[PDB]
């Protein structure tokens, strides 16, 4: 008569690493590293992303005519730029503090596009019909949907002064541009004053702009430039535009709401009818495990990104069926 | 192992014990079979459950973390920002891989300890009424029926009750 003390074995082929020994086959184990994704862009906590299509941030804000227009009001959980954004700034020049604007838009949850300065009504005695071939649409020369190229009318450019009081109860994002012609002949033919200036003020913003005429190497077949500027007009505050030339005026502006947990990602994937708590540029992860090796960029509630190929904890025993 | 039992003086495990991590196999006249020691198995599960949950709990949820952009005159800021992303990633890759190795070592040793503790718990119950025939088994110097085997398993073995018969067979 005999009794024996022993331990469990089974048919598991799980392996784990330890300090003293690699590749130990064990009976029961737990994986801590998520490495799978679904290849799709998904809703995040029920809210769809803002997909910019053929545009980048700059092209959507300025109103590039090549990009399909969006509904006047959008809400989103994160913004998706495509890697091959061909449509952005179409008239060459510099977007000032562009990178800080992106960072601001990373915490915006919603916009409402609205006509801040109605076209035929805000700049009397000035031409508003200017277009260019650098910003073409359906072959024809066109212009930014959100801005307006004000030019001379009947051989004069009178000094203008317009202003907007923000009663939207949310920050308003105002964008404008400043044109720089390549020679003083075109400066006269367009704004009739060689010593033009533009002035833009709010309670807290204060900047003045001067034409800088010089020949420049052609970009998109243009020897002049157009710089672009922006400010966030606080609720109740007033923005005043004053100029006697060279101003690319605001026509449409954005009332903005703030949010949490949003972001901008660049992604090759497509939107699908799916929902997730965690989004990467490659696809959505479910978020039960503590680590993930799929992407360092994440939106939402996500595991922590690590370079590991394997993170497996043993729970059972050294498996010896011999 | 550190405690000599698993893969030690108990060379292998039992595919036949399907209801627990630690247990017993017996052989008497009424028959033979396996039975697992639930009290030690449930202790081990409780400890490893806590170990696994603590490993997950120390890792906070990772909220949104996306890149920034920089212009051509902000390289130093872009390199600092890259240094911060790489540095935190270096550290968390290291922390995760090391914590799992270190806990895997201790988890195997914890099992090895539990087996041996059970073996010594049985050995001290039987004393000289049986003999260690190696490999983690005991041979009784007396007849041990199912009721006797059950008394060893649940820690109530009656040493005097069989001491005489054992002394005789031991001679």
């Amino acid at each position: 008569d005999t009794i024996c003390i022993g331990y469990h074995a089974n048919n598991s082929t799980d392996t784990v690493d330890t300090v003293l020994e690699k590749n130990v086959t064990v009976t029961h184990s737990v994986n801590l590293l998520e490495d799978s994704h679904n290849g799709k862009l998904c809703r995040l906590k029920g809210i769809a992303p803002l997909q910019l299509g053929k545009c980048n941030i700059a092209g959507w804000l300025l109103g590039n005519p090549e990009c399909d227009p969006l509904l006047p009001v959008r809400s989103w959980s994160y913004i998706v730029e495509t890697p091959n954004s061909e449509n952005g700034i179409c008239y060459p020049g510099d977007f000032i503090d562009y990178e800080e604007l992106r960072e601001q838009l990373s915490s915006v949850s919603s916009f409402e596009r609205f006509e801040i300065f109605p076209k035929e009504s805000s700049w009397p005695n000035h031409n508003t019909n200017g277009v260019t071939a650098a910003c073409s649409h359906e072959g024809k020369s066109s212009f930014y949907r959100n801005l307006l190229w004000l030019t001379e009318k009947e051989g004069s450019y009178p000094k203008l002064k317009n202003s907007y009081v923000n009663k939207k109860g949310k920050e308003v994002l105002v964008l404008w541009g400043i044109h720089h012609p390549p020679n003083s002949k075109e400066q006269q033919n367009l704004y009739q004053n060689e010593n033009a200036y533009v002035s833009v003020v709010t309670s807290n913003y204060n900047r003045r702009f001067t034409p800088e005429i010089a020949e420049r190497p052609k970009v998109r077949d243009q020897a002049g430039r157009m710089n672009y500027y922006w400010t966030l007009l606080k609720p109740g505050d007033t923005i005043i535009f004053e100029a006697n030339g060279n101003l690319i005026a605001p026509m449409y502006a954005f009332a903005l709401s703030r949010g949490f947990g949003s972001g901008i990602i660049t992604s090759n994937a497509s939107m699908h009818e799916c929902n997730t708590k965690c989004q990467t540029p490659l696809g959505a992860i479910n978020s039960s495990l503590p680590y993930q090796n799929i992407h360092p960029v994440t939106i939402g509630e996500c595991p922590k990104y690590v370079r590991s190929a394997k993170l497996r904890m043993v729970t059972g025993l050294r498996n010896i069926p011999s | 192992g550190l405690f000599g039992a698993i893969a030690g003086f108990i060379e292998g495990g039992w595919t036949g014990m399907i209801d627990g991590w630690y247990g017993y196999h017996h052989q008497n006249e009424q028959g033979s079979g396996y039975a697992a020691d639930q009290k030690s198995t449930q202790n081990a599960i409780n400890g490893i459950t806590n170990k696994v949950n603590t490993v997950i709990e120390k890792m906070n949820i990772q909220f949104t973390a996306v890149g920034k952009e920089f212009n051509k005159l902000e390289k130093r800021m872009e390199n600092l920002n890259k240094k911060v992303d790489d540095g935190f990633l270096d550290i968390w890759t290291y922390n995760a891989e090391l914590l799992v190795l270190l806990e895997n070592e201790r988890t195997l040793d914890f099992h090895d300890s539990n087996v041996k503790n059970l073996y010594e718990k049985v050995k001290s119950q039987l004393k000289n009424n049986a003999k260690e025939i190696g490999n983690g088994c005991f041979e009784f110097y007396h007849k041990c029926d199912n009721e006797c085997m059950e008394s060893v398993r649940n820690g109530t073995y009656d040493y005097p009750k069989y001491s005489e018969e054992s002394k005789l067979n031991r001679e």
Binding site: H28 | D19, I48, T49
Partner: peptide
């Protein structure tokens, strides 16, 4: 989390 490896384990 639970390690329910056998049904008699509890939750």
């Amino acid at each position: 989390x639970a390690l329910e490896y056998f049904e008699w384990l509890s939750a």
